[PDB]
Amino acid sequence: NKQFHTGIEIKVWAIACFAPQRQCTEVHLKSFTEQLRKISRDAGMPIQGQPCFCKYAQGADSVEPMFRHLKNTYAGLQLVVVILPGKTPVYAEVKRVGDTVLGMATQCVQMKNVQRTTPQTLSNLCLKINVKLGGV
Numbered sequence: 001n002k003q004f005h006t007g008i009e010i011k012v013w014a015i016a017c018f019a020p021q022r023q024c025t026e027v028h029l030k031s032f033t034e035q036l037r038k039i040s041r042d043a044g045m046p047i048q049g050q051p052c053f054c055k056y057a058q059g060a061d062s063v064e065p066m067f068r069h070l071k072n073t074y075a076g077l078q079l080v081v082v083i084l085p086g087k088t089p090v091y092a093e094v095k096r097v098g099d100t101v102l103g104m105a106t107q108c109v110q111m112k113n114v115q116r117t118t119p120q121t122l123s124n125l126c127l128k129i130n131v132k133l134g135g136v
Contacts, residue, residue, distance in 0.1 A: 004127075005134030008045040012076045014053040016066055019085040019111040021056050029054060029083075032114040039122045045130055052077070060093040067097045067104060079129065082108045105132050 015033075017024060033049060040047040052074050057066055070077060082094050091108060098106040107129050113121045 002131060004043070004045075005130055006044055008130065008133050010040075010045070010047040010078050010129075010133070012074060013047065013051050013079040013081065014070055014074065014077060015051050015055070015081050015083065016063075016070075017054070017056045017083040018058065018062075018088070018090045019056075019083050019114070020058075023085070024083060024111050024114055028115050032117055035117045035122055036125065039119065040126050040129075043126055043130075045126060047079075047129075051081075060089045063090065063093040064097050064101070067094075067102055071102055071104060078105065078133065080104060080106045082106055083111055083114050084108050085111045107132060 015029065017029065033051065036047055037049040053070060055066075057063075067080070070080060080098070082090075084090055094106055094108060098104045107125065109125055113125075
C-alpha cells in the first residue's frame with residue numbers, strides 16, 4: 001500500500017508464458033492483455049495493447065536463455081510479464097535472472113488469473129507494476 005505514481009507509459013513490453021499452451025491458450029493471452037490495457041489506461045498508467053514478444057516456454061532452465069534473448073533483441077524493453085502455472089521453481093529463477101543477473105523488470109501473474117480475469121485481480125497487477133516502474 002503505497003501511493004500511485006503518475007506519468008508511467010509502458011510501450012515496449014513482453015509476455016513469457018510458462019503455463020502450457022493447451023491450458024492457457026492464445027485467445028486467453030489476448031483477452032487478458034486487452035483487459036489489462038483498458039484498466040491500466042483508465043488508471044493513467046497505460047500499457048499498450050501489443051507486446052513486442054509473446055512466446056511459451058517450459059521449465060526454469062528456459063528462463064535465463066529467454067531473458068538474455070529479450071535483452072539482446074528489444075531496445076527500450078520496459079517490462080516482462082511472466083505467466084506461471086501455480087507453484088513452480090520458475091518464479092525463483094525469474095527473480096534471480098531479472099533482479100540480479102540482467103537487471104530487468106519482471107511481473108509474475110498466475111495462470112488462473114490470465115484464464116479468467118477480474119477487475120480486482122487486474123487492479124492487483126496494475127498496482128504491482130506501478131510500484132516496480134514508478135520511482136525510477
